[PDB]
Enzyme design. Structure first.
Site, PDB file in Angstrom:
ATOM      1  N   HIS A   1       0.823  -1.210   0.000  1.00  0.00           N
ATOM      2  CA  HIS A   1       0.000   0.000   0.000  1.00  0.00           C
ATOM      3  C   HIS A   1       0.876   1.288   0.000  1.00  0.00           C
ATOM      4  O   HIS A   1       0.320   2.373  -0.038  1.00  0.00           O
ATOM      5  CB  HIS A   1      -1.085  -0.004   1.092  1.00  0.00           C
TER       6      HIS A   1
ATOM      7  N   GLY B   1       2.186   5.990   9.608  1.00  0.00           N
ATOM      8  CA  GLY B   1       3.617   5.964   9.346  1.00  0.00           C
ATOM      9  C   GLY B   1       4.323   4.747   9.917  1.00  0.00           C
ATOM     10  O   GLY B   1       5.467   4.471   9.539  1.00  0.00           O
TER      11      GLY B   1
ATOM     12  N   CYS C   1       3.469   1.592   9.385  1.00  0.00           N
ATOM     13  CA  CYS C   1       3.371   0.468   8.467  1.00  0.00           C
ATOM     14  C   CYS C   1       4.751   0.017   7.999  1.00  0.00           C
ATOM     15  O   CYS C   1       5.654   0.844   7.809  1.00  0.00           O
ATOM     16  CB  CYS C   1       2.454   0.794   7.295  1.00  0.00           C
TER      17      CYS C   1
END
Ligand code: M4L
Ligand code: M4L
Lengths: 304, 304
Positions: free
Chosen positions: A41, A143, A145
């Site tokens: 993503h 942030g 991830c």
């Protein structure tokens, strides 16, 4: 003595954390050998997350669009590919800090440490468990991830989790290092509700043995039970059914303390039925389920 | 979202851990620059710990009697000195992994991460708080002495604790990195009972703000209180008296949530008087006091 929710030393993982940017999205990546692993993503915009077609989004992306920075130095991207929900960015340099490592897909109930990161920088480390409903109760902000979960066996780091998303319920979902999500979750901003979060019975029993080993014995009673009788109680209290495999894995703790697994089950049964009565066990006022029997032995024996 | 007892990433400290042996005693040391810091009870035998005369015991010790090993390589000892309850072993090589560091003596109520070590090897990391009675509720076994506590401000490691002993009550005592014990404890195997372990009120309030920030709001009530009224309740429940300095330090959390400090105090007052009624806050069934207002802000903002 003393019992703490202890995480593995994070150094080996810290040396793998990098920052990956694609367009206007920045998240964390895991640099091992000449490959950087990150959530796919990263190629999405906020509008894309509603229903992204990752294959179509990746077509508009070239190696030069993935900015990978390790500390303050830029890595050169020479290849990119998508494996399930992760991107693998081939870089021209092997990470000199790559530890001995494995990629493992854990089972629900197993524990692991998380190194929360932002912009490729570590903020903290904590111990987690994969819930029976395949979510994790972490601590992650926007942030985070690409932050990973792992276990350490002497010198080998077994990466088991990569953080991808937060469900509207505040719980966390992610993948193994092959990009496969734990549970039914998809990397999409959609209605994804978690299933029943049951209690990891084998872990609660392991934590009860840890309590006896460290002096907290008030909950020990004069009773015993059977696996089927105990499981009737466990079903009523949304506890995982205990199996003979679980009894077998609790063998060393039963041997150490001299308390038969079924006797400890009877103590757990009474605690479920009567509560703690305002008392505590290992500084907790509830039954702790994020310590496996392996964790208890490791902490109580000092495995480095 | 989510709230966890998070420790600092331990990498910077792992690169400082060494094994120090003297005679038949092995414990951990901290290697910074060309100096190795370790508990002075490394020179003691089990018989010596009853009432050791450290100055007389150190007279029979030369540089070659202190075996310092970093990983699998031996450090050469060129000097030894005793500073309070720590030994400083001057080695001929500066630690190439020495981070930017400071030695700080913390105040009771402050938190820090511990990297538990055995034979110079890290086993795990966990978050701790210096109790108001100057003990720490750690997780340490025989051989863990010399393990250190620390905080990290971006790239600087502030060492604040070095583990020395376990009291018969299962709680832990140690020193700052100048060898001064926190509290009245002496490095002697003698009757040392800890004082009253009061609850760190400012930390519980900070954790209550963390709960509101993460969605747990059931405990918010329609009441307010005053500092003197609240402190009457805090005295009854063995909570530290709240001061205007504490209210001031909770300012950013009060500003973030829009809940006045005294209103949050009134919620805490009712929780002390009525209990949780079988409910939980941030996955805990008791009032958590090992998160400072700084920790809450740091975790809720993602400081790396
Ligand atoms: C505030 O965001 C977070 C907080 C904690 N952990 C993760 C995130 N990020 C997200 O959940 C978000 O980027 C997203 C949305 C939909 C699908 C995916 Br895949 C990823
Ligand atoms: C089982 O021993 C431990 C467990 C946890 N933490 C520390 C220890 N070690 C000791 O307490 C022991 O070596 C000792 C005795 C008397 C004074 C001093 Br100074 C040191």
């Amino acid at each position: 003595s003393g019992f703490r929710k202890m995480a593995f030393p994070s150094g080996k993982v810290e040396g793998c954390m990098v920052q990956v940017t694609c367009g206007t999205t920045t998240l964390n990546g895991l640099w091992l050998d000449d490959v950087v692993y990150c959530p796919r993503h990263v190629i999405c915009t906020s509008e894309d997350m509603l229903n992204p077609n990752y294959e179509d989004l990746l077509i508009r992306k070239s190696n030069h669009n993935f900015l990978v920075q390790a500390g303050n130095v830029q890595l050169r991207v020479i290849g990119h590919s998508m494996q399930n929900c992760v991107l693998k960015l081939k870089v021209d340099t092997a990470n000199p800090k790559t530890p001995k490592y494995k990629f493992v897909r854990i089972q629900p109930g197993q524990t692991f440490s998380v190194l929360a990161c932002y912009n490729g920088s570590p903020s903290g480390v904590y111990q987690c468990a994969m819930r029976p409903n395949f979510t994790i109760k972490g601590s992650f902000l926007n942030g985070s991830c690409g932050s990973v979960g792992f276990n350490i066996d002497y010198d080998c780091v077994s990466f088991c989790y990569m953080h991808h998303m937060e469900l509207p319920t505040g719980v966390h979902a992610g993948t193994d290092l092959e990009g496969n999500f734990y549970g039914p979750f998809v990397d999409r901003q959609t209605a994804q509700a978690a299933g029943t979060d049951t209690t990891i019975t084998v872990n609660v029993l392991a934590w009860l043995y840890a309590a006896v080993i460290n002096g907290d014995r008030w909950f020990l009673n004069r009773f015993t039970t059977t696996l089927n009788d105990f499981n009737l109680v466990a079903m009523k209290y949304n506890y995982e059914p205990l199996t003979q495999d679980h009894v077998d894995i609790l063998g060393p703790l039963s041997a150490q303390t001299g308390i038969a697994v079924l006797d400890m089950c009877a103590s757990l049964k009474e605690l479920l039925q009567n509560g703690m009565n305002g008392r505590t066990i290992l500084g907790s006022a509830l039954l702790e389920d994020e310590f496996t029997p392996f964790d208890v032995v490791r902490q109580c024996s000092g495995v480095t």
